[PDB]
């Protein structure tokens, strides 16, 4: 938030699945009934994350913390053929 | 400093309150940067973050909770009598008071739900955590501080989130258990235990005789019979065209369009799309598929309505398709008109009630004695059934029509569609056995007829379990007849009356009343 | 300092041996020479406050009187003679000798007998402080030996925070479900008499005066537990309830206290003898009280709902509305056969919870080089086994008692035990078997209201065969009039009481040349 200068920052967290207690901070972090609240080890003041965007990616759904797979919404990506790869690879 | 002022607005006991003493004092005259003194640090975080003796104020009043139980969701009779009962009980009391429930049905009938409105009429706070991947009673009764990264569990976590005594802790999916996990959770579940719950990190022992605890599970079979003992098992049920369209209209195109933000004025949802919906598009016993395609149509209706495509969508069949694409499951049954070798039978899973037919067939043609190939992922206990089936078959068949030599000579092939789902459950002995001399005779049955029950060896018809559920499925696949064993007429007149309305019902003791009704 | 004088003045009152007195003053000593700040100085401070916290010769003080304890044992659980004997005997050995006494007992049966109740109430009985220890599941050994000092966190293990919180050297520890342990080898030491007294723990680094504890563990199978760990303990059986005794329990404690968890009083909510009797005979069948427990809770919770809601001030529970509170009875059918066919013959089980009546059926698979037998039912492997020696036996019977008979020489036999998704074992149903096989032979039915157990040897001989209490229970239930067991289980049988064996004319036979004489 200091480096981007702005108040809505758009985060992007990837390999949400290969994590370790962090997993609860990041819980929290995406719930937005408390993110208005948030408060880390360093400041002693609260700081307002609700107008942040988050945006998750991981290989695969089965992310060891469970709450994290009713609080995301599953898109799919799916592959491509060898002439959309060309065109891409063209590009 | 902070720490101290914290356990001012609770009721601390003294077990833990001369522990917390001096472990401050211990870190107070420790240093401000060993890591010790991290381990003391976290050590009294946790001692000092749960809520001792803080309790929610509830709510004993019948109508209220009524009211608001009968509003958020559709039928689930049982829960809400269960629920009243408890109510009743506690003022009877005079005092909170905590059980144990468990709910369990097929997944996407409203189990995890209706618990958020039970926490809701009772106001006591709620919080979920899943047990369904647990492998070790680590994760469930924390670690000792001894071990590096160790946590209070999870309890401990609930009682620290939810900032009360007597909250309701609802566990998923408890069915599924690893490899011991389920010795924790009885400890954890029993009532004598409750009062002085130790866990691992937190040396202190909690209690936990206020809260109460739901079970949320797929089939009781598999939960642990320890378990089974602790627990009070009541059944969810699955849902008819009717239910489902009534539980569709009422809750889930309202809360799908609030949740994408439209309105009534923008996005109707005609009941005939909706019928359409069930019928064809969502084959299963709950409305976790209705449910997202309501959403998606809600959602592409949205996103219409920004582009200034249209100002306001009216959802159609006709127009249906441009929305949620073309039809699935575009027939009702894969028989609809059963040839000889074919019967149509009833099956119980953990996903809920299913139909299923059994198909016969020559492997080679008439003119040493017969055989029968069993295939389709059959389990053992099917296997030895399909077996008693075969010897029943031929014992009734050399006394029923002594000139047939078909069943003592020919080689039969028996296959049971969708074989690459494995199957099992000696239910299917009638069903086998009817397949059998229906081949053999070459006269097709009742072409709706379905049947279920465990056949012996002399014929007598046993009973089965998961009436409820095949009745369900069998209204669900269009049938009119449907013939059950004699010993489950208890269990089957428990349905509601509209469930067992067009169905004709037949009870029976013995292999000849089937053979009377099928031919 | 005044840490010094803290620690000092816990011994006090306690009376410290010389082997930890010389620990204790030792780093008392060694804590003045460090800084208040050192790490060093903080696991001596750790280390002090374990040792001066044990209770060093403090024992609570037992009441020996035979008649009180006896009031309260009585006062609390219904008919566990085996339990109350040994605790009769363990108080009448401890007043003899004048102190207090420790041992190790190991109460064993099904779930829901009562076995952690009953510890619960032998402690409230003599005294003692009272302690729960579940070692079911329990994986590492840290837990009762603890880890090394030198280690950032430790532990004294669970014994040493169980005299700790008990501030006695002679509590009553439970050490439940020692059967479903992952590790054992530590217990070893915590139990071995030998040794016990002398029991070590990693952290202390001193060893603890454990000889006076009474450990009292629970189990509900006897075989999994090691032979080593099972040989150091004295195994106590409480056995299951019949219906007679199901129907005292309820009566006497099991309505009570859930009308108190209810809050209901008798003059709102009466429920009748008969309809407990109805609960337990077709509502509920187990060996425990488990379920009976919850039927009378469901009936109490309809109670109570009805008197507040206003439906009615008062409610009285009979067989005639029964089902309006706990809906149909789930068991109703009492038998499988009431009149048995040619080709089956009644059978006795040793079920869990409780024996069960089993059926062998038989029958042609083809009409009319030799026979063979088809055996389905989910039989066991010792259970075919038993199926094969009874083919043979009933071969070699009928070629010697009927020579022209041909039946069972090339007919093709398919034999069946009904509800086969139960798996099933044991070598009980040799002579069933041998019976079937014979009445199907002879085209001739057996005695309608015969049953039948016992293991067959090869040559004939009936071999005796266990739980005889459980099919004896299961064959009054069905209704069996005549009963056919070993010879060898004639103690077995007349060891039940009277009541339970006054209506069965029972057969005690040592070969098949008789047991077909009394089916026939
Ligand atoms: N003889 C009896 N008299 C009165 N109540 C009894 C008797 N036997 C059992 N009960 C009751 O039955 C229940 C059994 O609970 P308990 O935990 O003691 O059983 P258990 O068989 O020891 O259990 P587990 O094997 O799970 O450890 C208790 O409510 C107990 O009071
Ligand atoms: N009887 C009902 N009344 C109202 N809504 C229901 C009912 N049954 C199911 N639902 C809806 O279905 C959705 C999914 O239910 P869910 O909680 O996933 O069930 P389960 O926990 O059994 O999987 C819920 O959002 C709920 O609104
Ligand atoms: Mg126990």
């Not at chain 2, 019902?505 to 089937?514: A, G, L, Q, S, T």
Request: aromatic letters at 6%.
């Amino acid at each position: 938030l200091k480096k981007t200068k702005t108040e809505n920052p758009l985060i992007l967290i990837d390999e949400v699945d290969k994590i370790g207690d962090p997993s609860s901070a990041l819980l929290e972090l995406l719930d937005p009934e408390q993110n208005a609240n948030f408060l880390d080890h360093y400041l002693d003041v609260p700081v307002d994350l609700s107008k942040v965007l988050f945006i998750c990616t991981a290989n695969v759904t089965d992310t060891i913390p469970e709450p994290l797979r009713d609080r995301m919404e599953m898109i799919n990506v799916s592959g491509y053929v060898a002439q959309e790869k060309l065109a891409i690879a063209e590009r | 400093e902070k720490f101290r002022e914290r356990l001012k607005e609770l009721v601390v006991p003294k077990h833990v309150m001369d522990v917390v003493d001096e472990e401050l004092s211990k870190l107070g005259l420790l240093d401000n940067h060993s890591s010790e003194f991290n381990v003391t640090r976290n050590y009294l975080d946790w001692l000092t973050s749960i809520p001792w003796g803080k309790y929610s104020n509830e709510n004993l009043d019948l109508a209220r909770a009524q009211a608001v139980l009968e509003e958020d969701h559709y039928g689930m009779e049982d829960v809400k009598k269960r629920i009243l009962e408890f109510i009743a009980v506690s003022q009877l009391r005079g005092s909170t008071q905590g059980k144990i429930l468990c709910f369990y049905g097929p997944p996407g009938v409203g189990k995890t739900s209706i618990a958020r409105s039970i926490a809701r009429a009772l106001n006591r706070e709620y919080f979920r955590f899943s047990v369904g991947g647990m492998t070790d009673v680590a994760e469930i009764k924390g670690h000792r501080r001894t071990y590096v990264g160790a946590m209070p569990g999870k309890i401990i976590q609930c009682l620290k989130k939810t900032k009360t005594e007597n909250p309701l802790i609802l566990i998923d999916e408890v069915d599924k258990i690893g490899r011991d996990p389920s010795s924790a959770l009885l400890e954890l579940l029993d009532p004598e235990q409750n009062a002085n719950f130790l866990d691992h990190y937190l040396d202190v022992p909690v209690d936990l005789s206020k809260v109460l605890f739901i079970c949320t599970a797929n089939v009781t079979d598999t939960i642990p019979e320890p378990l089974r003992d602790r627990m009070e098992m009541i059944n969810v049920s699955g849902y008819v065209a009717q239910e489902k369209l009534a539980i569709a209209e009422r809750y889930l195109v309202p809360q799908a369009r609030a949740l994408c933000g439209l309105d009534e004025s923008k996005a109707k949802l005609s009941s005939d799309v909706l019928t359409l919906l069930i019928k064809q598009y969502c084959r299963e016993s709950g409305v976790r598929n209705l449910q997202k395609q309501v959403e998606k149509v809600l959602r592409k209706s949205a996103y219409k309505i920004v582009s200034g495509e249209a100002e306001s969508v009216e959802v159609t069949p006709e127009n249906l398709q441009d929305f949620v694409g073309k039809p699935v499951f575009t027939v009702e049954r894969m028989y609809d008109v059963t040839p000889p070798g074919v019967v149509m039978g009833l099956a119980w899973t953990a996903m809920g009630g299913s139909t299923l037919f059994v198909e016969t067939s020559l492997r080679r043609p008439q003119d040493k004695d017969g055989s029968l190939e069993v295939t389709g992922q059959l389990g053992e206990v099917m296997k030895e059934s399909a077996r008693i089936a075969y010897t029943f078959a031929r014992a009734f068949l050399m006394q029923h029509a002594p000139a047939n030599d078909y069943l003592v000579t020919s080689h039969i092939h028996l296959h049971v569609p969708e074989g690459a789902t494995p199957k099992d459950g000696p239910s299917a002995g009638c069903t086998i056995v009817t397949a059998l001399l229906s081949l053999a005779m070459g006269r097709p049955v009742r072409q709706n007829l379905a049947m279920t029950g465990e056949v012996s060896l002399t014929g007598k018809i046993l009973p089965v379990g998961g009436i409820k559920e095949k009745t369900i499925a069998a209204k669900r696949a269009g049938v009119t007849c449907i013939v059950l064993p004699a010993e489950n007429k208890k269990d089957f007149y428990d349905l509601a009356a509209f469930i067992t309305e067009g169905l004709e019902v037949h009870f029976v003791e013995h292999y000849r009343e089937i053979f009377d009704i099928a031919f």
